[PDB]
Design a protein around this motif. Structure first.
Motif, PDB file in Angstrom:
ATOM      1  N   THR A   1       0.834  -1.192   0.000  1.00 10.60           N
ATOM      2  CA  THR A   1       0.000   0.000   0.000  1.00 10.60           C
ATOM      3  C   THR A   1       0.872   1.247   0.000  1.00 10.60           C
ATOM      4  O   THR A   1       1.874   1.318   0.720  1.00 10.60           O
TER       5      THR A   1
ATOM      6  N   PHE B   1       1.246   1.484  -7.761  1.00 13.10           N
ATOM      7  CA  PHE B   1       1.577   0.700  -8.949  1.00 13.10           C
ATOM      8  C   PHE B   1       1.872   1.582 -10.158  1.00 13.10           C
ATOM      9  O   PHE B   1       1.367   2.708 -10.254  1.00 13.10           O
TER      10      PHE B   1
ATOM     11  N   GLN C   1      -9.793   5.562  -8.795  1.00 15.92           N
ATOM     12  CA  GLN C   1      -9.618   5.784  -7.366  1.00 15.92           C
ATOM     13  C   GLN C   1      -8.272   6.436  -7.068  1.00 15.92           C
ATOM     14  O   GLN C   1      -7.275   6.204  -7.755  1.00 15.92           O
TER      15      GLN C   1
ATOM     16  N   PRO D   1      -4.039   4.752  -2.894  1.00 11.69           N
ATOM     17  CA  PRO D   1      -3.277   3.620  -3.447  1.00 11.69           C
ATOM     18  C   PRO D   1      -3.744   2.265  -2.945  1.00 11.69           C
ATOM     19  O   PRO D   1      -3.750   1.295  -3.714  1.00 11.69           O
ATOM     20  N   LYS D   2      -4.138   2.169  -1.673  1.00 10.06           N
ATOM     21  CA  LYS D   2      -4.616   0.897  -1.140  1.00 10.06           C
ATOM     22  C   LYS D   2      -5.864   0.430  -1.878  1.00 10.06           C
ATOM     23  O   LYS D   2      -5.960  -0.733  -2.290  1.00 10.06           O
ATOM     24  N   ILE D   3      -6.829   1.333  -2.059  1.00  8.07           N
ATOM     25  CA  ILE D   3      -8.069   0.974  -2.736  1.00  8.07           C
ATOM     26  C   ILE D   3      -7.792   0.568  -4.175  1.00  8.07           C
ATOM     27  O   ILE D   3      -8.338  -0.423  -4.671  1.00  8.07           O
TER      28      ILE D   3
ATOM     29  N   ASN E   1      -4.982  -0.634  -5.510  1.00  6.67           N
ATOM     30  CA  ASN E   1      -4.295  -1.919  -5.566  1.00  6.67           C
ATOM     31  C   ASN E   1      -5.247  -3.070  -5.269  1.00  6.67           C
ATOM     32  O   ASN E   1      -5.228  -4.096  -5.963  1.00  6.67           O
TER      33      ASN E   1
END
Ligand SMILES: CC(=O)N[C@@H]1[C@@H](O)[C@H](O[C@@H]2O[C@H](CO)[C@@H](O[C@@H]3O[C@H](CO)[C@@H](O)[C@H](O)[C@H]3NC(C)=O)[C@H](O)[C@H]2NC(C)=O)[C@@H](CO)O[C@H]1O
Ligand SMILES: CC(=O)N[C@@H]1[C@@H](O)[C@H](O[C@@H]2O[C@H](CO)[C@@H](O[C@@H]3O[C@H](CO)[C@@H](O)[C@H](O)[C@H]3NC(C)=O)[C@H](O)[C@H]2NC(C)=O)[C@@H](CO)O[C@H]1O
Ligand SMILES: O=c1ccn([C@@H]2O[C@H](COP(=O)(O)OP(=O)(O)O)[C@@H](O)[C@H]2O)c(=O)[nH]1
Ligand SMILES: O=c1ccn([C@@H]2O[C@H](COP(=O)(O)OP(=O)(O)O)[C@@H](O)[C@H]2O)c(=O)[nH]1
Ligand SMILES: [Mn+2]
Ligand SMILES: [Mn+2]
Lengths: 801, 801
Positions: A20, A24, B95, B98-100, B102
């Motif tokens: 996280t 990417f 989105q 970054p967590k969402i 990925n």
């Protein structure tokens, strides 16, 4: 940097790590996407699978569209509606049955037109509130039609076509504003009498019998001659009466309607399942109404046509909801004069409706009338005791109570079967008070109003009398004989009496509480007010006596029988002998048996449903019947061994012989002779079991984002939890109230019984009971005599005044 | 010929006729279709609306796909899965977090791979049974991590990453065959002791206290020195113990878990809502399991790492289901040696686990052990009576009953909190008998097994002892002190005692019924069989005496107090005086008050929930407490005014002083002195209220065509109606059984009491009661003394044998 997740769902088990904050690189993701080719194959399969649609898939899509539209979302509703319309249009060609193809084509065109209308509305071109699909009723030919049937006259369109429409109206008062109409209003016929036949989980035989009886009544009304003083004049003449009567059959839910009933309805051309399934796909109907002018033939005789509207509710609800729909929607639309209500299975007689209409038209002051109720086939199968006891109870209650209450023009309770009203005194406030429960949540109403379940008939009966700025009085007609069917076993009788007793007690309390409104608001004659005052005093005394009935019965039996046996007061035998063991043993046995029986009854009644406890209830009933028969025999012996006196004979007459006197006066004496012995063996069972079980089960009563998704889930969960807590609190309150009432009743009875036993003797208590019973029965006998005098005199003396 | 239905859904009301049998001409329908152009506009709008997808829509589509897949339909499942995968892949780019992004990308890739696998399976290329999406666990970094925390040693990957996976296993026995694994098994660590902490609707404070106590226990286990006779050797040594303990926290449902508990779990890095919402979109998980090696710090001290597996069930189920999941899945996978079970909030002490493991390792014959249970903060807030009474009851019950049953090596019931077993004697048949209810519908089991609710612990305890071809005996450890929390009010105590009494009585009946299996099947020593026979006789006598407790209490109080007052037998006062009114008035008042109290209690208990009836229960408890205190004072006066005798002093000792003797022997004497007065004031309340209410609420317990559509609807309705009827029948049977049992109990007690009152005197009944009570208490005292001798001797005498 995406890991090696090319085969992650394919393999049985795959482990991966998703960091996280890196977000990417898009280039690597695109390269991974472009490196996979097998997906196209799957895509091809889907493109091959979606070519041919299916009927069930189209119906499911339309149902989802309706649900989304009811959920205030329109874009998804529009997309689903367009998809379903196109799917149905494509499907309609493949079907082979012409009916199915035509219905599918019509539904597809209707859906496409609704899609166009909604698309126009979204742009703001059309200004409306809560847009809904347009009302589109469909008339179809009947599958089975009787070629050989001779009626007065029937147009081909009316005779051979049945009409159907689903309705969406959430508040039935708006049934006419939304644009719905019936066949009767369109055709130009204006019915004057409306009959509602509620139905829920009933066999075809009862409905067939009710319809046959209604047809016979209409034929008898038609065949009467004119020019006679007793003949009705107006819209109820001959050869045209069948056009002034409308019958509303209001079912209670597709889930519970007996399948044979549906088959019978389809046989007479009133219910077609294919039309219901197809036409109601996307409307989201609260109810579906079919209209027809049905013709019925029995054996080699043909009856008269009957205009019928069959309303079938999608969900399940209480009878009060059916009356709400019927009264509000249909009465507000058609605006009739007389409204009649009856339950399914109430088999009338030939001369019932004629008498009711005659009384209504002649009197002009009757705000509501009810007919006599009787049991079908009382003499047949005389071996059974329960049927005979119920027949005797119906006869005595009808004669005495109805006569006395009709003398003062205030009937406590019109029977739920075969009652009638004039649709001028119940249009406004009385109907609003009738349907107070359905419009206000039970939390606001409170426990007292909420517990008045299955008792709203008395509420309407009181509201009609005490309506402001009007003087409407209820009335009772003797000849309107309606034959019902009664349960043949103890358990069904117990359940029915539970409902009736709960409703009766709480409605009586409400009426006694609010009786003052008659003097405060109503505009009655002074003599009427004085008569109402006298009847109010009598009602208070009778209710007070009836609240202390079990204790009085126990005291009477105990004192008379056992303290005549123990203290040597039986007149046909001397008990000064014996070894002093039997004398106390009899009393001890009686007391212990009575207490154990009461304890068992209360535990069982409060505990479980009285259907699997058949043996225990039978045993208790048998014990109490044996006790009552023994007490009756001892009392008869005492009376016939006494040398008799004026006081004794007067008491005996005014206590027991009032029933025989009234029955001989009204000519219904043979039934009393047949059934008095059977009824005498169930009085303690009646009182104890029915009252205790009624008071025991009183509890029984009715394009967002991720943050938006999370907030929506949290809000939905919180709302559901709050609703659950509120429901639990309401149930707690009702249970507490019923428990408090039961404790008060039982402890009052026990304290009174103990005090009378310990601080009084037979010579100091029995005269008071005799005086009370004699007074009540004398008042009832005077009421019955007055009613008979009125019914046999007012016809001849109507010329004078 | 289609009618003019061009504007049918657009207008408010439209009437049309649809003939049947004509089938319509296709040319006219096509001409009507081609004459409408507005539809294209709507189409354009839809084509504009569907361009941009949404997260919530994708999740809904995936949920529908999972539901369809669970419904044995694959083509629609394939289409919905492909649509959802493409939608999520498109959405992932928009989105910002970054967590969402990925997580969405990973979920989309997994969904597409599963779609490819299912498409391959449909063609028959891959041969499987019940295809399901592949297992894909995800490890993510923890949001909050303590920089300043010094532990033994922690790898970065283990310390800073929490793992998650949803499971689908419908039968937990197959949890390992489906390919699921845990972090502990993968890493190579092989834990030996497993602790299960059930949780449902609990505040964060209890969980925090339990975890802190567990960490303290692990630290104490670590700090012990080697080379000592009392020191454990093996995998439970120092500096490496924390790797051999695993803690399973099994919740009971997202709908009922307290939100603050979820916040606390997220704080220590064990629950992340975004990951749960995203990853479990289409699997259709029965449960979600998170894995971590959590580190806890309290104030300025750092505890030891604890390996934790948190399993959260999607639905709600009884504690037995949680034990089913825990035992079957995790025990079958890891295969530990010792399995410990405790409830949330059970705060242990420093030296509990050490004593338990010491006993298990040294004895080698113990098939299960349980610790002493005590109330937290008994001395604090001494004003309250209920807490002191419960503390006294726990102490006395523990000491006497546990000691006596441990002497024979058969504990009747291990506490539901802090019990332990060895995972070699419960792997086979005993666990199958433990989970008999969850695998067989209650209709087949019958009423007796079904009514054994909240009692399966005794079932497991009996099955361990009576296992075939083995000799496993249970044992009790004195030092394993666990501190729980008890309700502070009467109502919670009433509910808890209801559950406990129902379970205890029916489990005791089952054990007495099936005791013969020990001799028939088990392989025990002959001396063990003789000891079991003696204990069986004692158990039968104690149960028989306890079944007739209310009558015995009433008789004792009545006889002693009132028939010493009335018949002038109190020794410190002469009642030969007075006007003969008080002498009978006292007895009458006592009898009437007792009967009215019992009637009120039984009516209320059978009637409604005991939460809104607080005042009545308080009043009845106060009355009974006053009565018992008065009786105790009178008895004390009688005893202290008697000139005393050997028989009298022996009876007094063996009746009352056994408690004090045992408490002084075990050193817990101060608690008894503090709480005996408080406990003496609740004995009648305890017996009557708890037993009656326990027995009152026993009912509480857990591409087709049109013809295909019609048949499907009919079949579904018929199946639903049959299921409803079966459920109603089952409830009827259970209610009937509970009513029969309650009637039998109450009538047996009443008949016995009446017979003893009428056919016996004080001089002819009290000696029997004294003998019975003295015998029972003597047996219990001998058992306690034997247990103390064993616990203080076997350590030193273990060298001899
Ligand atoms: C309790 C008391 O003081 N007197 C008793 C009367 O209450 C009772 O009269 C009955 O009242 C009930 C109240 O509605 C009537 O029930 C209706 O019955 C009809 C036809 O059976 C049915 O269609 C209705 O559904 C039902 N109303 C409901 C369920 O709400 C009942 O008809 C009355 N009986 C008569 C003859 O009028 C009488 C009857 O025995 O007993 C008194 O002791
Ligand atoms: C009725 C009788 O003959 N003797 C009474 C004992 O039954 C009772 O012992 C208690 O037994 C119950 C049975 O399980 C135990 O309940 C468990 O309690 C633990 C901790 O409180 C809890 O975690 C479990 O959920 C619960 N089991 C359930 C709900 O199924 C209880 O712990 C036993 N008490 C003790 C000290 O061991 C004692 C207790 O007062 O009283 C006897 O009179
Ligand atoms: O959920 C229900 C149950 C019953 N009823 C109707 O209410 C009356 C119930 O009458 P009851 O069973 O008390 O006596 P019955 O006259 O039917 O023997 C009948 O007309 C039923 O059709 C109803 O409308 N909804
Ligand atoms: O639906 C439920 C209700 C309770 N429990 C658990 O079962 C025990 C109930 O214990 P009780 O309330 O009788 O006594 P407590 O020890 O909690 O005070 C606790 O561990 C609860 O977490 C459960 O798993 N599921
Ligand atoms: Mn009926
Ligand atoms: Mn607890």
């Amino acid at each position: 940097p995406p890991p090696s997740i090319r085969s992650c769902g394919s393999q049985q088990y795959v482990t991966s790590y998703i960091p996280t904050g890196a977000a990417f690189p898009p280039s690597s993701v695109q390269d991974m996407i472009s490196s996979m080719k097998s997906y196209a194959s799957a895509t091809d399969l889907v493109r091959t699978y979606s070519e041919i649609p299916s009927v069930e898939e189209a119906l499911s899509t339309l149902d989802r569209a309706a649900a989304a539209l009811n959920a205030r979302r329109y874009r998804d509703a529009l997309k689903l509606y367009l998809e379903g319309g196109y799917a149905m249009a494509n499907v309609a060609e493949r079907q082979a049955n012409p009916k199915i193809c035509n219905l599918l084509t019509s539904k597809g065109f209707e859906t496409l037109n609704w899609c166009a209308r909604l698309c126009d509305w979204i742009e703001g071109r059309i200004k409306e509130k809560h847009p809904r699909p347009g009302v589109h009723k469909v008339g179809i030919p009947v599958s089975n039609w009787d070629e050989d049937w001779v009626g007065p006259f029937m147009d081909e369109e009316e005779a051979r076509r049945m009409w159907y429409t689903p309705v969406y109206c959430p508040h039935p008062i708006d049934f006419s504003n939304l644009g719905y109409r019936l066949r009767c209003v369109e055709t130009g016929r204006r019915p004057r009498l409306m009959i509602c036949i509620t139905m829920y989980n009933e066999g075809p035989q009862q409905l067939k019998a009710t319809l046959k009886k209604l047809a016979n009544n209409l034929a008898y009304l038609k065949e009467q001659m004119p020019g006679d003083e007793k003949s009705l004049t107006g819209a109820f003449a001959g050869d045209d009466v069948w056009q002034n009567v409308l019958v509303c059959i209001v079912a209670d839910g597709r889930e519970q309607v007996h399948p044979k009933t549906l088959d019978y309805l389809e046989a007479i051309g009133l219910y077609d399942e294919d039309l219901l399934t197809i036409n109601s796909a996307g409307i989201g109907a609260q109810c579906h109404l079919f209209e027809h002018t049905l013709q019925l033939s029995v054996n080699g005789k043909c009856l008269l046509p009957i205009q019928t509207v069959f309303a079938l509710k999608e969900n399940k609800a209480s009878k009060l909801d059916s009356h709400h729909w019927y009264f509000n929607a249909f009465a507000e639309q058609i605006q009739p004069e007389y409204t009649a209500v009856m339950d399914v299975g109430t088999m009338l007689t030939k001369s019932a409706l004629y008498h009711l209409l005659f009384a209504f038209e002649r009197n002009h002051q009757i705000g509501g009338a009810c007919g006599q109720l009787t049991v079908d086939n009382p003499f047949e199968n005389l071996s059974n005791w329960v049927i005979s006891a119920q027949h005797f109870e119906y006869k005595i209650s009808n004669i005495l109570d109805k006569s006395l209450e009709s003398c003062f023009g205030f009937i406590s309770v019109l029977p739920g079967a075969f009652s009638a009203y004039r649709y001028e005194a119940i249009r406004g406030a009385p109907l609003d008070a009738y349907f107070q429960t359905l419009n206000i949540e039970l939390d606001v109403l409170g426990p007292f109003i909420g517990n008045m379940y299955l008792a709203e008939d008395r509420i309407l009966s009181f509201e009609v009398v005490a309506r402001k700025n009007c003087n409407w009085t209820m009335h009772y007609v003797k000849d309107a004989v309606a034959r019902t069917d009664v349960p043949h076993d103890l358990v069904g009788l117990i359940s029915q009496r539970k409902r009736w007793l709960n409703g009766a007690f709480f409605a009586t309390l409400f009426s006694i509480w609010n009786w003052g409104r008659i003097y405060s608001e109503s505009k009655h004659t002074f003599v009427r007010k004085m008569a109402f005052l006298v009847f109010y005093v009598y009602h208070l005394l009778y209710t007070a006596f009836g609240f202390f009935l079990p204790a009085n019965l126990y005291l009477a039996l105990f004192f008379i029988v056992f303290q005549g046996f123990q203290q040597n007061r039986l007149e046909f035998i001397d008990t000064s002998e014996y070894s002093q063991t039997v004398l106390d043993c009899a009393v001890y046995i009686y007391n212990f048996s009575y207490l154990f029986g009461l304890l068992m009854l209360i535990i069982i009644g409060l505990g479980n449903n009285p259907k699997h406890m058949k043996l225990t209830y039978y045993f208790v009933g048998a014990v109490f019947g044996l006790m009552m028969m023994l007490s009756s025999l001892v009392g008869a012996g005492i009376f016939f061994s006494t040398p008799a006196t004026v006081h004794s004979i007067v008491v005996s007459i005014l206590t027991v012989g009032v029933y025989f006197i009234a029955s001989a006066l009204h000519g219904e004496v043979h039934h009393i002779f047949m059934t008095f012995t059977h009824y005498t063996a169930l009085i303690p069972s009646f009182v104890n079991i029915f009252t205790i079980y009624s008071f025991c089960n009183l509890q029984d009563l009715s394009k967002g984002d991720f943050k938006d998704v999370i907030a929506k889930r949290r809000a939905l969960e919180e709302l559901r939890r709050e609703e659950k807590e509120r429901v639990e609190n309401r149930k707690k309150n009702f249970e507490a109230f019923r428990t408090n009432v039961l404790l008060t009743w039982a402890f009052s009875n026990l304290i009174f019984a103990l005090f009378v036993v310990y601080f009084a003797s037979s010579s100091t208590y029995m005269p008071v009971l005799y005086i009370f019973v004699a007074s009540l029965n004398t008042c009832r006998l005077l009421g019955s005599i007055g009613h008979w005098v009125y019914i046999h005199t007012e016809g001849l003396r109507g010329r004078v005044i």
